[PDB]
Symmetry: C3
């Protein structure tokens, strides 16, 4: 049984601009574990990682039927499983969370399906 | 059980150009209730509302296996609930309609999953 | 129950460059039947078709967890669907595109 669906599309430029401005951005969006990978990356990949997590969390919030400003970015965490795919390691949902993220050199998209 | 899935992306610019070559464009795309919302917004947000409604209605039509021009714009209605999330208040479907909409400065995407 | 979910966004440029780089790109990405369609098309519509197929197959591959073993055709209503794929459950596919990129979404259900 499906109990929610959310999607999100984001321009990487907006994320790169945010990072270039205040250093506190990535920190607000990512947990400690996520920051570990974020800081281990270089150039485009580094921005893409952050953008993807932002998009995934935004998509999840919509899947729950609300805004990320109510859940909070630190309330969610996206790591990579043994098969290398991104997944919610932390989220206020008990069922299965189907997540998928994809990007180009200009956009990142994410889709979330909550299942019970 | 899932009975349909559809996604759609619309360029805001195309929507506005349409609002230009056809003065009554909005009126034909939106229901009376959607029009009342549309007429209360302005600038970018107004266009985004209209474009997002088009995306949602097309995503749904594709989820039903067809197109919006065939299904009819007036037979679909997307309003916003108490939490501000878009949802189908009107549709020729007896099951659950899981809708999500997201946009950038230039595009708006919608994803619909139908469930019985 | 859902057993997989995958999406993809692909810029038309990556596909356009790929076609030129190796003329056999399309042939490698598309099955015989898909190629027949590709070849019958021209210009932007032709590129879009190739990009949409690449996108859909990528989305499917990500949903599962050779693009020649995957085939996406169009039904009588014009909607794209997987006619061939290493999965016996239901494959819910949807593709959409702008002038610069294509997106695809796949949900696998049993």
């Amino acid at each position: 049984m499906i109990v929610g669906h959310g999607i999100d599309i984001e321009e990487l430029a907006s994320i790169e601009s945010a990072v270039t401005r205040h250093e506190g951005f990535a920190k607000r969006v990512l947990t400690a574990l996520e920051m570990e990978r974020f800081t281990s990356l270089k150039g485009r990949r580094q921005i893409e990682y952050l953008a993807g997590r932002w998009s995934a969390k935004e998509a999840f919030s919509k899947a729950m039927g609300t805004g990320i400003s109510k859940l909070g970015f630190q309330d969610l965490e996206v790591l990579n499983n043994e098969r290398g795919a991104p997944y919610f390691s932390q989220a206020p949902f008990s069922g299965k969370i189907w997540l998928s993220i994809s990007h180009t050199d200009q956009f990142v998209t994410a889709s979330v399906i909550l299942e019970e």
